Every structure is written in structure tokens, then in C-alpha cells.
Amino acid sequence: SSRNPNAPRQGDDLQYRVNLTFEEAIFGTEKEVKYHREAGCRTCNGSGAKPGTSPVTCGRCHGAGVINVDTQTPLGMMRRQVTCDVCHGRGKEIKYPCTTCHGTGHEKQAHSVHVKIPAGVETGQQIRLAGQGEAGFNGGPYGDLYVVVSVEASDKFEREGTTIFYNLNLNFVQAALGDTVDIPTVHGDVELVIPEGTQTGKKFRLRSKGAPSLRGGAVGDQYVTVNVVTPTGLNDRQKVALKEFAAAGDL
Numbered sequence: 001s002s003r004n005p006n007a008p009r010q011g012d013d014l015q016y017r018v019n020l021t022f023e024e025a026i027f028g029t030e031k032e033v034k035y036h037r038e039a040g041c042r043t044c045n046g047s048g049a050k051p052g053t054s055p056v057t058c059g060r061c062h063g064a065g066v067i068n069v070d071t072q073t074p075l076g077m078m079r080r081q082v083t084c085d086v087c088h089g090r091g092k093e094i095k096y097p098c099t100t101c102h103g104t105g106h107e108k109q110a111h112s113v114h115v116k117i118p119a120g121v122e123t124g125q126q127i128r129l130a131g132q133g134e135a136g137f138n139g140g141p142y143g144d145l146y147v148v149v150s151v152e153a154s155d156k157f158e159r160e161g162t163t164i165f166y167n168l169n170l171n172f173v174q175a176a177l178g179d180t181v182d183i184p185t186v187h188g189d190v191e192l193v194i195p196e197g198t199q200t201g202k203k204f205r206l207r208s209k210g211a212p213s214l215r216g217g218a219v220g221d222q223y224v225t226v227n228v229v230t231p232t233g234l235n236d237r238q239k240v241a242l243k244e245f246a247a248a249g250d251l
């Protein structure tokens with residue numbers, strides 16, 4: 001959005017997709033990220049000239065970057081500026097460019113970054129790290145680095161925001177008579193008491209066993225949801241107990 005062709009301009013942004021485990025995301029964590037950015041030659045100090053040589057005033061534009069283009073009218077003179085045949089900038093140290101960056105002041109560096117992942121992130125949350133990402137032009141600023149969280153599934157839990165979700169399979173006997181089960185939690189295990197008579201679908205709410213909130217909130221909750229499993233692959237002693245169960249209870 002500026003007419004000066006050699007105006008300063010910010011470098012390209014970068015994106016890193018970082019893979020987390022279910023729990024890494026629930027809690028905090030930290031990673032070092034290794035990658036190759038374009039950074040700006042340390043070998044030439046940013047000007048693409050063999051050290052001990054120098055950019056020099058242009059052998060056409062005479063230090064202007066532009067060629068005045070003057071045309072005689074009846075009433076006067078027309079001046080058109082067109083950007084220089086050669087330098088397109090200011091100087092012209094092209095006879096001796098830096099060896100590594102082939103003249104443009106930008107070296108492929110190897111870079112590493114220390115990232116605090118705050119507790120509670122979900123897949124697709126981004127973090128902006130200001131300095132990182134690619135080199136600016138004509139002395140402009142450095143790009144930003146953007147990491148997107150990508151969270152791996154759990155074998156036990158589903159999640160959504162602060163809330164954790166666990167399904168409990170109960171058998172008929174446990175459902176009818178009640179029972180006490182150990183319930184997995186991202187914070188460790190928790191004993192839960194199942195009343196006698198539990199209907200399938202029942203939702204139990206464990207307070208503050210869910211995920212920490214990004215926006216300063218208190219920890220969320222883990223909701224346990226009961227599923228009653230019909231039994232299958234039943235031997236004859238088992239089918240007798242049930243037929244005998246049926247009879248006891250229509251008497």
C-alpha cells in the first residue's frame with residue numbers, strides 16, 4: 001500500500017502444527033520447535049555484498065533509483081519518473097555479492113523457539129510468537145510464528161472445552177444391585193457409587209475433574225454417563241437364573 005518500491009515491509013508469517021497428547025493439552029506444557037526460516041545473512045550483515053565490499057551508488061540513477069523521463073511540449077516539459085533500469089533501489093554493489101545469500105540479504109537459518117502452551121488448549125488454537133517467522137525486506141520487521149495446537153484423542157475420554165466426558169459400561173448385576181467402581185480421570189482415579197436400581201443413561205457429575213479454562217475460569221467437570229450392557233453368549237446355568245429371576249418377580 002505504498003509507492004516507494006524500496007519501502008520497508010514485514011517478513012512472511014510462519015505456521016507450525018504441534019501435536020499434543022490428550023493430557024498435554026489438558027495441562028500446560030512446553031516445547032522447543034526446530035525449523036529453518038529465512039533470516040537475513042549473518043555472513044553479510046543483511047546487505048548482499050561480499051564482506052569487505054559495499055553497496056555503491058548506482059552507475060545510472062546516480063543514487064536516485066529512478067530515471068527522469070523528460071519530453072518537450074509546446075507549452076513546457078513533461079517529466080515522467082520510471083524506476084531505474086538497474087538498481088530498482090539505491091546502490092548497486094552487484095559486482096561483489098555475498099557468497100551464501102547470492103546477493104539478497106536473506107540466509108536460510110536454523111532456528112529454535114521455546115513455547116509455553118497454556119493449560120486448556122483445544123485443537124486449532126493458535127499462539128502468536130512475534131519475532132519468529134521470516135525476515136523483513138529493506139530493513140522492515142520480522143514476521144510472526146503461529147503454532148496451531150493439534151490434540152490427539154484419548155482412549156478413555158471425550159472433551160469439549162472445560163468439560164470431560166466418560167462412558168461407564170455396567171452389567172445387569174451391577175445396575176440392579178448397585179456397585180462401587182473406580183472411574184478414570186485425567187487427575188487420577190475416583191471411586192463412584194452406583195445406586196441400586198440404576199437406569200441406563202444416568203449422568204453423574206464429578207466436580208472440578210474436567211479441564212482448566214483458558215480464560216481464567218475454574219476447572220471444569222467430568223460427566224460420567226452410564227451404559228447398561230445386555231449380556232450375550234450365555235450358558236444354560238445363566239439362562240436358568242434369569243428365567244428363575246423372572247418368576248420370583250411376578251409373584
Ligand SMILES: [Zn+2]
Nearest residue numbers: 041044098101
Ligand atoms: Zn549474505
Ligand SMILES: [Zn+2]
Nearest residue numbers: 058061084087
Ligand atoms: Zn539506478
